[PDB]
Amino acid sequence: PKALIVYGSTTGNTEYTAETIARQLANAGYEVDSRDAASVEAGGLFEGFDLVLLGCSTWGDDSIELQDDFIPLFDSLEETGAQGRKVACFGCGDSSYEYFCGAVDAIEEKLKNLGAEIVQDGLRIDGDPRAARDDIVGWAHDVRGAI
Numbered sequence: 674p675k676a677l678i679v680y681g682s683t684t685g686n687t688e689y690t691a692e693t694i695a696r697q698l699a700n701a702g703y704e705v706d707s708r709d710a711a712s713v714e715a716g717g718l719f720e721g722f723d724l725v726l727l728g729c730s731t732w733g734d735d736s737i738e739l740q741d742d743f744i745p746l747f748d749s750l751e752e753t754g755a756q757g758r759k760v761a762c763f764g765c766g767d768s769s770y771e772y773f774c775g776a777v778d779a780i781e782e783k784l785k786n787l788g789a790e791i792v793q794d795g796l797r798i799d800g801d802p803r804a805a806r807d808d809i810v811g812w813a814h815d816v817r818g819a820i
């Protein structure tokens with residue numbers, strides 16, 4: 674079908690992760706449009722995608738702070754056309770720090786009550802994803818059998 678990926682990556686782990694998801698999708702005979710996020714503007718941004726994939730790294734340590742590029746999107750996730758949209762979420766973190774991938778936890782909270790349809794619990798990556806490469810591949814594959 675037609676899937677979307679918006680991601681926020683500060684050092685690249687979340688980016689690696691997404692392109693891994695994206696090559697696996699496309700390879701599944703999809704249509705995928707992958708974006709960095711910084712170049713996305715809320716304004717009906719999900720509107721025409723079959724599947725939408727949000728994904729978010731986490732910083733702050735003492736509090737949960739969304740990856741810099743992600744905040745504005747997040748703040749306008751209302752203007753996206755989230756309602757009734759098919760969505761899944763994925764992000765990178767460290768089991769260390771208290772709030773282990775809160776950004777993830779937040780983003781979910783808010784499109785489910787935005788009316789979005791969480792098709793699968795999301796990917797919470799501990800450490801280097803290159804080290805959890807097949808685990809994305811498993812998930813990516815899991816989002817595929819949900820819809």
Ligand SMILES: Cc1cc2nc3c(=O)[nH]c(=O)nc-3n(C[C@H](O)[C@H](O)[C@H](O)COP(=O)(O)O)c2cc1C
Pocket residue numbers: 681682683684685686687688730731732733734735736737740765766767768770771772773774775800
């Ligand atoms: C100062 C600092 C704070 C961090 N806080 C968290 C955190 O609260 N939760 C988490 O899962 N990871 C935390 N991390 C680890 C990052 O999430 C990790 O670098 C992540 O894999 C980066 O993904 P990215 O390169 O797409 O931004 C923190 C890292 C630093 C340097």
